Design an enzyme around this catalytic site. Sequence first.
Site, PDB file in Angstrom:
ATOM      1  N   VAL A   1       0.912  -1.327   0.097  1.00 14.05           N
ATOM      2  CA  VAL A   1       0.165  -0.036   0.183  1.00 14.05           C
ATOM      3  C   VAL A   1       0.906   1.106  -0.156  1.00 14.05           C
ATOM      4  O   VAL A   1       1.963   1.186   0.817  1.00 14.05           O
ATOM      5  CB  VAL A   1      -0.846   0.112   1.090  1.00 14.05           C
ATOM      6  CG1 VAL A   1      -1.809   1.069   0.972  1.00 14.05           C
ATOM      7  CG2 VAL A   1      -1.804  -1.438   1.506  1.00 14.05           C
TER       8      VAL A   1
ATOM      9  N   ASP B   1     -12.425 -12.412  11.843  1.00 13.92           N
ATOM     10  CA  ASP B   1     -11.074 -12.036  11.813  1.00 13.92           C
ATOM     11  C   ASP B   1     -10.787 -10.521  12.122  1.00 13.92           C
ATOM     12  O   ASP B   1      -9.928  -9.940  11.601  1.00 13.92           O
ATOM     13  CB  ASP B   1     -10.176 -12.722  11.007  1.00 13.92           C
ATOM     14  CG  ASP B   1      -8.748 -12.973  11.285  1.00 13.92           C
ATOM     15  OD1 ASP B   1      -8.628 -13.197  12.573  1.00 13.92           O
ATOM     16  OD2 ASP B   1      -7.952 -12.863  10.328  1.00 13.92           O
TER      17      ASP B   1
END
Length: 350
Positions: free
Chosen positions: A33, A144
Amino acid sequence: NQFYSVEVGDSTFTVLKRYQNLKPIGSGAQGIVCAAYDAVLDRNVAIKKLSRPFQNQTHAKRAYRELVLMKCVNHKNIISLLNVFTPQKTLEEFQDVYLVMELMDANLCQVIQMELDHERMSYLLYQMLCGIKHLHSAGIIHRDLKPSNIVVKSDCTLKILDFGLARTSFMMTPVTRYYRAPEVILGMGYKENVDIWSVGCIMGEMVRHKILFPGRDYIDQWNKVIEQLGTPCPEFMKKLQPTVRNYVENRPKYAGLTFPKLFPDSLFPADSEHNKLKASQARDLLSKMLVIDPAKRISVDDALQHPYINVWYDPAEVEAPPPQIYDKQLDEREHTIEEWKELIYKEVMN
Ligand SMILES: CCCCCCCCCCCC[N+](C)(C)CCCS(=O)(=O)O
Ligand SMILES: O=C(Nc1nnc(-c2ccncc2)s1)C(F)(F)Br
């Protein structure tokens, strides 16, 4: 040519020329990213180059589901897709996917390290519950949630980055497992309030500035759970698997520490009446989220009514209409890698 190439974060980004001055801000198994400046929009964006999306079917399924859900969900506490592109021109040559998101300033791991402030803590938790409620209303049960998957702006606005297992709880990662619920770890099945355990773990970590249930594997993690919270009731071992019950039932029995001992007054801002009130309310909410048996664990809707959180409640934020995922068989249907590739390519091309 509308694209240019730049090496950044030890990877080659090939991006549209509107995206300028790329700077690494993060990495992981899912991708790399960068922060960038978008000259068309005159604003800063985040660009995620998906890491090997077609290396196997788990990667391809994750990439397709992430793209489809990020497009379809429109909620202030879930990250939104501003643009998606590929520099390759045909389905034959198609290899790389770039997601463009609004740029946030930090992830929640970094924010968690700051000194606990009740206004900020309650606001962050409120926003997490808002985003979770919205995902749940579309049948997206995350299972999660963890601080690294949640990002925050300098004004404390908060966005969840990913969708977990979505509308699928086995997780092949190929990771940070400290936030997974007991019913996930122990293989018992789950309901919506599986995500409340993860919020409780994050909240307790904001207070203690330590991971609540750390440890090298699930065996170690379960030991930390029972040492602190106590051996669960036989009504839970009954709902438990007859095989895995044997190990769990043969562990040493623990009473558990009370929540006053798990989260003592020493961890909370002190010496005002307002701070004394808020310490008791925060501990009360923790005591209702950090509950091993999901049958006894508070729901998302009731956590939003809890006095620690409800100060923030705005119906316009909490009660938004659920996303309609018309693409059924998502998270159930399997496909070859070539079939996932064509599905993803169509989604990139809109
Ligand atoms: C201290 C660590 C112990 C690890 C225990 C590993 C347990 C293995 C799990 C198998 C359970 C499968 N069933 C019962 C069919 C439920 C599947 C549905 S779901 O996947 O639970 O949603
Ligand atoms: O960190 C990861 N994913 C991300 N996805 N969006 C991110 C972001 C960061 C800051 N502002 C906006 C978006 S970081 C991963 F790849 F390791 Br799973």
